[PDB]
Ligand SMILES: C[S@@+](CC[C@H](N)C(=O)[O-])C[C@H]1O[C@@H](n2cnc3c(N)ncnc32)[C@H](O)[C@@H]1O
Ligand SMILES: C[S@@+](CC[C@H](N)C(=O)[O-])C[C@H]1O[C@@H](n2cnc3c(N)ncnc32)[C@H](O)[C@@H]1O
Ligand SMILES: COc1cc2c(cc1C1=CCN(C)CCC1)N=C(N)C21CCC1
């Protein structure tokens with residue numbers, strides 16, 4: 002049963018419907034869907050355009066001489082992102098200071114969602130997000146979008162369920178509780194199929210990466226998307242509830258934690 | 261003797277290309293600036309971008325009704341005839357806090373440039389911008405885009421030719437000298453066919469209106485676009501050059517200066 006034809010109300014490149022064939026819960030409305038991060042705290046991001054590293058290409062930035070391409074860290078594009086073996090990977094997309102055209106090949110994340118997703122009711126994990134088409138390894142899925150808040154503010158938010166940390170070693174957080182995009186509905190999987198990548202577009206302030214999800218393997222039609230929320234989340238939450246990802250390899254179920 | 265010397269000065273950043281032609285002289289397509297399609301800053305502007313305090317509507321349609329709390333556009337994206345073209349009020353477009361669909365009728369400026377424009381070499385005023393199509397009165401043309409700076413920083417800029425004052429009353433300016441869009445090339449006309457309007461979209465920091473040009477009459481294909489730069493400019497620049505607008509009632513010509 003279709004409870005909403007587009008939770009994004011046209012804010013994304015494509016519609017993101019919500020269905021619930023499992024239970025009585027209506028299409029969630031306790032948040033505001035936004036497609037880009039909102040700044041509701043006090044931080045000053047360095048947006049100084051003269052600070053940007055930029056390329057001088059006048060092709061499609063598909064050559065290895067593209068300076069922006071060369072700045073990528075712990076990852077790189079083949080045709081699709083690959084990651085280095087074993088600190089998160091950094092992508093520097095082209096920006097307003099680059100000489101290239103708006104439609105160069107180094108603007109994947111800033112160009113937005115391309116894959117077909119659906120918000121759906123899962124059996125045991127509330128709302129989740131699934132792929133409606135096959136998605137090859139290394140494909141951009143969606144950004145993790147919300148309010149940029151400080152570490153102090155995140156620690157006192159009443160609900161911690163929608164936080165994503167921007168951590169160097171001084172930390173900032175993206176809180177998708179009140180304002181967020183489709184990513185706020187992605188569950189934890191102990192068997193993850195997407196990974197977060199730190200991306201820079203309009204600014205290159207290393208304290209404030211944008212978080213982009215890329216597939217970590219080929220994903221089949223119908224599969225739930227999920228990332229590894231990590232030990233910080235589970236060390237907190239496992240004292241109240243345990244993982245219901247249902248994987249034969251689950252690391253956070255009551256059974257796995259007892260053993 | 262006009263051939264395209266650049267097919268798109270905006271490098272595909274706008275919805276339509278903006279070609280550059282020169283049938284007057286030997287000047288090359290301007291390259292002493294960086295074309296950008298949204299405002300930038302160098303030193304920090306403390307824009308208040310906090311979403312929780314935005315005024316916003318509760319429409320769940322396309323904001324074509326009378327009850328949209330966000331007021332000035334008609335069904336076609338044009339300023340309503342009531343709209344005071346002499347003393348423009350502020351426009352608050354829809355934002356991320358609004359309930360409506362992205363594609364609603366109150367996001368005209370955020371949708372960007374729709375009309376065909378051309379950067380061209382003028383006879384007597386350097387580079388200028390002209391319409392390559394008819395533009396009905398009250399149509400959005402383009403935004404004045406550049407580097408946001410304080411009025412105090414503007415007062416010390418070496419070149420003041422590309423400044424635009426952001427009306428609030430501390431005040432700010434856009435400087436399009438180093439970073440700007442097609443608007444940086446629009447000349448002064450004493451018989452202007454476009455007007456600037458302060459607009460708020462994603463934030464409502466009243467210090468930092470964004471400046472949108474709307475046609476003030478029906479404009480014909482080929483007509484040079486221009487707004488009235490105003491007295492702050494001519495009080496300064498009259499002593500360096502006179503107006504070449506060619507208007508019959510030109511208020512800033514060698515002739516008019518002489519009388520005054
Ligand atoms: C960011 S929300 C994901 C969307 C959430 N399922 C919903 O319905 O709104 C994170 C919360 O979802 C639930 N959740 C996510 N992954 C889970 C898992 N593997 N096992 C149990 N609950 C999970 C927990 O309540 C967790 O705090
Ligand atoms: C914002 S720039 C407009 C683009 C400019 N024509 C160019 O070639 O780069 C403003 C400058 O253009 C020239 N200009 C603009 N309008 C003019 C006019 N009506 N008469 C004479 N010069 C004008 C003056 O040099 C003025 O400072
Ligand atoms: C209990 O979960 C969290 C607690 C904190 C967090 C991030 C999470 C995460 C929440 C879920 N999110 C979707 C991804 C995992 C990180 N950042 C934080 N600062 C805290 C520690 C108390 C608030």
Ligand SMILES: COc1cc2c(cc1C1=CCN(C)CCC1)N=C(N)C21CCC1
Nearest residue numbers: 411414415420421422423424489493496
């Ligand atoms: C000489 O022209 C200007 C001087 C100043 C200005 C705006 C203009 C304008 C320049 C041209 N622009 C495209 C439209 C008219 C305003 N804002 C300013 N603060 C000053 C006063 C000295 C710097």
Ligand SMILES: [Zn+2]
Nearest residue numbers: 056058062067
């Ligand atoms: Zn490049």
Ligand SMILES: [Zn+2]
Nearest residue numbers: 056069095099
């Ligand atoms: Zn680049």
Ligand SMILES: [Zn+2]
Nearest residue numbers: 062095101105
């Ligand atoms: Zn590029």
Ligand SMILES: [Zn+2]
Nearest residue numbers: 191244246251
């Ligand atoms: Zn699990």
Ligand SMILES: [Zn+2]
Nearest residue numbers: 317319323328
């Ligand atoms: Zn409305």
Ligand SMILES: [Zn+2]
Nearest residue numbers: 317330354358
């Ligand atoms: Zn609105």
Ligand SMILES: [Zn+2]
Nearest residue numbers: 323354360364
């Ligand atoms: Zn609206």
Ligand SMILES: [Zn+2]
Nearest residue numbers: 450503505510
């Ligand atoms: Zn004149």
